[PDB]
Amino acid sequence: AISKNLPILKNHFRKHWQERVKVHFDQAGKKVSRRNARATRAAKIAPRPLDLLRPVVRAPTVKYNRKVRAGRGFTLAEVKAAGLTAAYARTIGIAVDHRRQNRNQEIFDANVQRLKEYQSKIIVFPRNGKAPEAEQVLSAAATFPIAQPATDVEARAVQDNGESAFRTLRLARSEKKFRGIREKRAREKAEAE
Amino acid sequence: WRKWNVKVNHNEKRYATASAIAATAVASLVLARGHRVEKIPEIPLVVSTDL
Amino acid sequence: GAYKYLEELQRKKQSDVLRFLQRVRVWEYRQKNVIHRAARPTRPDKARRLGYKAKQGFVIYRVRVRRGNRKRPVPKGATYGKPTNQGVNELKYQRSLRATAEERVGRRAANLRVLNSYWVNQDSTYKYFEVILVDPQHKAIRRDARYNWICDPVHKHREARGLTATGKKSRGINKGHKFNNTKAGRRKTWKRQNTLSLWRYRK
Amino acid sequence: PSRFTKTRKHRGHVSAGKGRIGKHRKHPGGRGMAGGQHHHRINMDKYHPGYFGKVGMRYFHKQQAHFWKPVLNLDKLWTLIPEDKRDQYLKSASKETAPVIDTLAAGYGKILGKGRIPNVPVIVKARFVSKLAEEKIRAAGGVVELIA
Amino acid sequence: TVKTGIAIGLNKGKKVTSMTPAPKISYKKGAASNRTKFVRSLVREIAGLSPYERRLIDLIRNSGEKRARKVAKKRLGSFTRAKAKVEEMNNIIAASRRH
Amino acid sequence: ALIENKKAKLVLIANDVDPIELVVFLPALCKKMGVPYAIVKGKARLGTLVNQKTSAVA
RNA sequence: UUGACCUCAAAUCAGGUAGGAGUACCCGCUGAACUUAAGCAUAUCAAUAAGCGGAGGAAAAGAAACCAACCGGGAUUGCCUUAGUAACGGCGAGUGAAGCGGCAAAAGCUCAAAUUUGAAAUCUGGUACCUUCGGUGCCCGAGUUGUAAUUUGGAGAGGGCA
RNA sequence: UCUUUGUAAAGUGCCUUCGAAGAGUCGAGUUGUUUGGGAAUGCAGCUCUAAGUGGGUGGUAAAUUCCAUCUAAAGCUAAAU
């Protein structure tokens, strides 16, 4: 059962695994069916851009803090700032997030500017017009790309004061570590007459 | 669930493609393939883009 | 409005008003059949907040189920297997008593659709519940688009498959880290994470 | 392929290479990792010391993203500066126009000092830094600016 | 809350311009209303008191707060509910003496 | 709603409301708000008054 | 004496609905043992087979009593990944997810509980007509213990000012 | 080919007052079962049983102080699967 020098393996195949095996033979088939569905869907909404204008958003964790991505919908704060209503925007392809908040100005401006860029670059047909077909684009995401904002210039002056940036990390960790203990010491000094 | 498709490195594919294009211009390999190019004035045979 | 008063009073279950009404009502309901048709709901506020409306085609049934564990139905308690499966007595039914109450009613009034159900009373042997049923082929429900969704065949025997409030509670259908085993369905989740996915170009 | 296997070469030989005396039976020593303490002890102890037992503390709900801190060594620091401007920066080594190296933007959490950068000043923006890596950066005339 | 601008420490995080957006209406959900109070006052004044709430009142008067809070915790779920129950049993004790 | 707003100059209550829950608070509602109320015999008599079968209040 | 109301009943009363089948997939309930552990009882097989109830072309889920801890995402589902990992296990044999990221597709919402009270404004059925997946009379009704309009937390309602 | 609807429908700005929001349910103990969930992941039986700046959650049980999030015990919903 166990024999010469090999890595110890864990192959979870003690259930009736052979009944639940899926081979994705239809990889090519599904892709064709998906492109057809995209093709037919775009025709049915012939002038419309096949997508809703999605917002810009910072990724949650500390791992993806550095990255900014396409979110779900625009905040009602952002939409009011642009000058529109959620009921109207949902009809002109601007997806709206009621659960989202804005606690950050740069996301606020980047999304509002995304909104003004949308309005100036789209034309809404009146309900009783002549439907002047206007060369539909199939992607609102590709029309307004999500570009990561730039942080600083590529070359600046060097300034130094003598911190090493290592002491400040050790101090920040250590101050945090003993902060709770230092309150209890200060509480005792508060009660000691 | 027998393995049917086998993955080839992209670069090796383009390596073998470039080798196959390069072997196109070699007369000896084209005859050895049996491609009846004895009456072709030159190889690689290139025609005007009217065709 | 008066339903807010009914709401606040009904929370005062242990008070003497509710306790006295409890004893006389539970005796009255027990004397009747284990499932019988309630002319009106005993609580206007509970029935209507769960989806009842005082209109033709909306129904309320009063039902009592037996309480306690579910004894393992084996002759002489012989389970014929490993000791871990030797238990007979202290085994618990996985569905609620509200679920069996409204499944038993749904079989009685099989023409209707179970909208909801709620507790009305309890004693040592019987838990008492009121079931709300909606007549799907009553034209007052076929029209009035606030209610006709239940006429669609995808809502046949919702109580049977666990689509009622107690049915969603028993299947553990809720958001959160606490329901990871039961989000898309426990059996659906299990089959999904017990499938060997093999792509054409093997990963 | 099947035609290159020794199963083809064993055709005609009785035991298929498995021996006449001790044959190919089903599971003569148990299944999987059976008997690892008992009759496979001589293998486990030789090749896999430490296999049995527990070692440390448990951590419930451990999020791997918490500890995401890829390290950038100082000898690899100048690979973050793009190639076209890199040659310009070394030959024009000077304060007041040092390149800004956003280490987090490249995908590294901590900066380690594996050593020997050139004396060209560089501004190094990092989340966490090592003592020596910041020491070496100053000696090259540059600075480490802690980025959150 | 203003971040320290570095990746470690008490207020670790990118120093940004805070905005503190307008409060969500779902945040006010737990607040009381004069509508809901008028109903609850008129419902308590007609419903009465539960047995354990009466036994709690005597426990406060005779045994004290410590013993009352103990039984309330047993009768109710947790410590938090126990103290809140005893606190309201104390308000009814003080109020009923006046009227 | 009439009693809560004090808009009631006089209110009668029936005693035949089989779920008493609907009318139990009515005397106490009528009291604290200071409107005159009488408990009266006949939910059917109330129904006849308001052109109904039952009204439980007039 | 004569009419109601409540509850209960009866009619081959007027008009309907349910039951069974199939069951690959789907939603639940119920539920083993062979086997593996070189024995075996927890474990494993397996929350499987068998058994029972209930659907549709999909079902379930689903617009957070969510995830997070960030400079925050933002219904659900599925794929890639997380990961044979955190974790569970005679800590043995074995078992074993989720957040983030990329993507496919993306769509939102609505009731209860509110102050129509200057008007039950509401709805079934019967007859009549018509341009019959219904509209308009009229009538009996149902319904104030609440059927319409209006609000659903992302809000909203009352009142003052374009 | 079939009116061209009558003193109505909804949306927005500023300012005042309010703003109901689901109970034998949540929650707690215990039992069984289940889960990767480990001083208890879910579910269920029984016992107890709430509240309104409350309640739930924040993966080690418990006081005290905060903070961050959502809003249960009611309901519909195509697509990708």
Give the helix level of chain F as a range of percent. Answer: 25-40%
Number of helices of chain D: 5
Name the overall outline of chain D: elongated
Helix content of chain D: 10-25%
Main location (chain E): cytoplasm
Family (chain E): Belongs to the eukaryotic ribosomal protein eL36 family.
GO molecular function, one term (chain E): RNA binding
Subcellular location (chain E): Cytoplasm
Structure commentary:
Chain A is mainly α. In chain A, helix 2 packs across helix 4. In chain A, strands 2-3 form a two-stranded antiparallel ribbon. A two-stranded parallel ribbon of chain A has the order 4-5. In chain A, 38% of the residues lie in helices and 8% in strands. Chain C is of the alpha+beta class. Chain C has eight helices and five strands; from the N terminus they run H-H-E-H-E-H-E-E-H-H-H-H-E. Chain C has a four-stranded antiparallel β-sheet. Chain C is globular, with a radius of gyration of 21 Å. Chain E is mainly α and 99 residues long. The radius of gyration of chain E is 22 Å and the shape is elongated. Chain F is an alpha+beta fold and 58 residues long. Helix content of chain F is 33%, strand content 14%. Chain F has a two-stranded parallel ribbon with strand order 1-2. In chain F, helix 1 links the parallel strand 1 and strand 2. Chains in contact: A-C, A-D, A-E, B-C, C-E, C-F, D-E, E-F. Chains A and D meet through strand 6 of A and helix 2, strand 2, strand 5, helix 5 and strand 6 of D. The structure holds two RNA strands. Chain F: It is found in: Cytoplasm. Chain F: It comes from Saccharomyces cerevisiae (strain ATCC 204508 / S288c). Chain F: Belongs to the eukaryotic ribosomal protein eL8 family. Chain F: This is Large ribosomal subunit protein eL8A.
Summarize the model shown.
The PDB classes it as ribosome. The structure is cut from a larger assembly and holds chains A (193 residues), B (51 residues), C (203 residues), D (148 residues), E (99 residues) and F (58 residues). With 203 residues, chain C is α+β, with helices and mostly antiparallel strands.
